[PDB]
Amino acid sequence: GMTEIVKASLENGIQKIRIQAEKGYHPAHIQLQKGIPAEITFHRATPSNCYKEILFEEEGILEPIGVDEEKVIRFTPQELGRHEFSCGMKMQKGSYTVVE
Template sequence: MALFKRKQKATIVVDKGYEPSEVHFKKGQPAQVNFKVKTDNACLEKVVFKDLGITEDLFASGAHTIEIPTEQAGEFAFSCGMDMFHGKVVIE
């Protein structure tokens, strides 16, 4: 029973904050968020998904892709390392 599930993808640009600061995915389909960094503002160096236990170093080389669990509807908040800039991923 190979049920084909298309991956949902969203890109968030990190510049003067998160743009967009909120992304939505459908429940039950794999999802990922990709952060594209356009700033050297140290405040935004790390993005933290507290509920997922993920801290990603956005100034490190390579892609910055976070896999988002979508088994349940709900929200995953994220912020910069100092908890000054905020955003969220909504599963619905």
Template sequence: MRIAKSAAACLLVFAFTVSSIEAHPKTVRISVTKKGFSSSSISAEVGSPLTLIFTRRSKEGCGNKVVFPSLGITKNLPVGKAVTVKFTPRQEGTISFTCGMGMYKGSIVAAEH
């Protein structure tokens, strides 16, 4: 019983250690100007939480919204206000985002690490 308990405790510690090593949360700030998203290409890790903070810098252009079609996320971007989009990529590949009209384009490139 004692052995079983300590073995279980060991496993728990091991699992916790592995999971805290595996996930690398990342935060990226993105400016939205009349030229589009800056930056517009962001690398990410599969399984690690990604936080994107969009700030629209200019009333000019059409950056009043950011849309992630594959994630079903749409956020309004008031000028000068930081707007956060959070998600965890679940598979390798590209996750696109655009302005409301699809003219400004950006992409998240998720890869295994």
């Protein structure tokens, strides 16, 4: 250890954070506050189709993302703890930890 966790920035009652998709997700591990609307912006910086989709299974989210495009994943985290996000193939993984 330790594992690097990046906290989402709180402003205007929204928590925002940007994630780059290229040779994995960066940051791969983030922290979110429970009950605050979250906007997680993914940028696909690779032409590999391994990254053509963004999956947040526990939120029922599955979103396509094109080469060099940015997609905002929006939800309000309600369940505490560590949750997984990944590409649509579940080959490249990350996590979001929801704290009180």
